[PDB]
Each structure stands twice: as C-alpha cells, then as structure tokens.
Amino acid sequence: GVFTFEDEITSTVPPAKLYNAMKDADSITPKIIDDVKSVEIVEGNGGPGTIKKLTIVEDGETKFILHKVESIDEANYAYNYSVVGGVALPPTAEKITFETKLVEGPNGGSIGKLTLKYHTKGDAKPDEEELKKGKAKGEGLFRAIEGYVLANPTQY
C-alpha cells in the first residue's frame, strides 16, 4: 500500500534560488552531509528516470543507496526522487518517494511542502520509527541545500 505524508516547512531563501540549488544536490550534499560521501550517476542524464548510487558511511561502514529521479516540475519549483534500494530502504518497504515543492512565502522566502510516500508490500503498514527516520532525512536534505545557499550567497 501507499501511505502519503505532507509537511510544510519554511525558508528565508526565495524559491527560484532554492530550486536551482536543489538541482545541484549531487555536488552540494556530500560536502555538507557528513555521512554522504558521493553520488554517482549509474544510468541517465540527470533528468527523470536517472538512477543514482549514493555511497554513505554509517558506524564506520560503507553502505550504498539507490535513487531514481522521478520528476522535475520547474513550473511548480519541484524536485522528486525515490529511494529504490539499500538500507535507507527498510526491509519491509518497496520504495520511498521524497517530493519537495516550493512556493513564494510572505517575506521574500519560501514555503516548502515535503511529501513522503511510503510504498509497502501488500497490506503491510509503514513502521513508525522508519517513517520518523524518513521524514528527518527529507528535511535534512532540504536544510543542506538551504544551508549551502545561505553560506554561499553569490552562487545563486
């Protein structure tokens, strides 16, 4: 079954900038996120359908995550990817989809909507700790990309 969750977040960065930085995530994330060591494209050109392998470290052990780029809807400043393999993929889960979309916020900033779609096998439900972990991850990437923009103002 598919279980969807949406959280609303805010940033002081305007959406066009955040969005341009969201597209450079493969370069930005390994710098900022300590556990993330690299992102390699396995198949594709970077657009929808592209498969990426992330190499991370957890407990001094190298582990691998597989991502699939799902859709990149500029008109709605949106960037969507799915975890399709690895330990970021809980044993009882088919797939996890992470969507981020941005609109203008009150004061030149942005309002973000982070969507988590947890695909389970058959009639299983998502494990609550795994959900908590997946939301933290989604928010973490957003705050990485945001952090990089705030710290490197001339680049965006």
Ligand X SMILES: Oc1cc(O)c2c(c1)O[C@H](c1ccc(O)c(O)c1)[C@H](O)C2
Chain positions contacting ligand X, by CB under 6 A = 25-26, 29, 33, 35-36, 39, 54, 56, 65, 81, 88, 137-138, 140-141
Task: Indicate the DSSP class of residue 124.
Answer: -
Beta strands in 12-154 (DSSP E): 36-43, 51-58, 61-73, 78-86, 93-104, 110-120
Residue 119 binding result from Na ion, ligand X, none, given CB thresholds of 5 to 8 Å by partner type: none
φ/ψ region of 60 (left if φ > 0, alpha if ψ in -120 to 50, else beta) reads left
Q: Which of Na ion, ligand X, none has residue 23 at its interface (CB below 5 to 8 Å by kind)?
A: none
CA 71 to chain centre: 12
Rank residues 21 and 54 by Cβ distance to ligand X and give the closer one.
54
CB 108 within 8 A of CB 14: yes
Considering beta carbons, is residue 111 or 135 the nearer one to ligand X?
135
Report the partner that residue 69 touches, choosing among ligand X, Na ion, none (CB closer than 5 to 8 A by kind). none
Q: How many residues bind Na ion (CB under 5 A)?
A: 2
Work out which of 11, 17, 18, 30 binds Na ion, going by CB under 5 A.
Answer: 30
* Residue 138 interface partner, choices ligand X, Na ion, none, CB cut-off 5-8 Å depending on type: ligand X
142 close to 79: Cβ distance less than 8 angstroms: no
Contact 142, 114 (CB under 8 A): yes
CB of 87 to ligand X, least distance (A): 8
Interface contacts to Na ion, rule CB under 5 A: 30, 36
